[PDB]
Write a protein that binds this ligand. Sequence first.
Ligand SMILES: Cc1nc(Nc2ncc(C(=O)Nc3c(C)cccc3Cl)s2)cc(N2CCN(CCO)CC2)n1
Ligand SMILES: [Cl-]
Length: 284
Amino acid sequence: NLKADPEELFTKLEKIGKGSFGEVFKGIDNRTQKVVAIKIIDLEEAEDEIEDIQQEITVLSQCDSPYVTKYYGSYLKDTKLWIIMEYLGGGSALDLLEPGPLDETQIATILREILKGLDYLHSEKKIHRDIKAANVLLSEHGEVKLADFGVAGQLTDTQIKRNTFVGTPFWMAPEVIKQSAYDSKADIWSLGITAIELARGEPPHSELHPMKVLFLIPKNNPPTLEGNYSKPLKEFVEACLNKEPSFRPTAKELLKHKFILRNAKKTSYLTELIDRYKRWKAEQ
Ligand SMILES: Cc1nc(Nc2ncc(C(=O)Nc3c(C)cccc3Cl)s2)cc(N2CCN(CCO)CC2)n1
Ligand SMILES: [Cl-]
């Protein structure tokens, strides 16, 4: 369902990011005047990532959830491919960390919405494989959605596990680094690392070279959350960061975890964080 002539339907506005894959622009849906995000990739300079792009578009085209960035479509325009998504204006969860620490209500609220996204994806037999705060985006009023499906994987009846080495090293599950047969439980490990990232501001080993953690993670005991945090938060992290994937809970099970039930509140309260970042960035 590749479409054509994107500028008949969208207005391309200013660059807002990226990067490695391509360049990302703000845009307008001319039909509704809603704002969109447009990733433009020139495919005559592709040339190996082309297979990954095809996979990314496939995954995007099959997702339909409040907890995953809304996909408008992929458009051919001469030599270039336009990947068009809803624009979320609140920043990423990583951005929201920059001015300072979160409290456990904010951490639980964000984790609960990530979990609803993971529950959705995993129920569709999809694996995100790059869960981290940078890939968790917020609307300007605090809605929280998963983004960047650039390395997302799909399980099928004939392929019940993946084994591809993808992800971001600090957040990668040990079985992914080992290139063992793995599934959605890899996302649950990454969620654990993300919980530490939300609590501490950065993942375990964050001051080491990424290549070095590739040997450390499979060997070392799993990270724990250290510091003056509630016991249920520490337990939530511990549950996620089990070396044996089958011992990790599902996303569905974690939604009922004491940490989430006791501390998560309305997403609209996250506007406080969004405002904090806006103030901070304006003074930086
Ligand atoms: C880089 C960036 N994106 C933003 N919102 C997005 N919504 C959806 C996105 C998305 O779907 N991208 C994407 C695409 C399009 C294809 C493949 C894969 C992916 Cl990941 S990106 C907001 C933002 N700003 C807001 C907050 N700041 C001001 C504070 O003062 C800074 C600027 N900056
Ligand atoms: Cl928004």
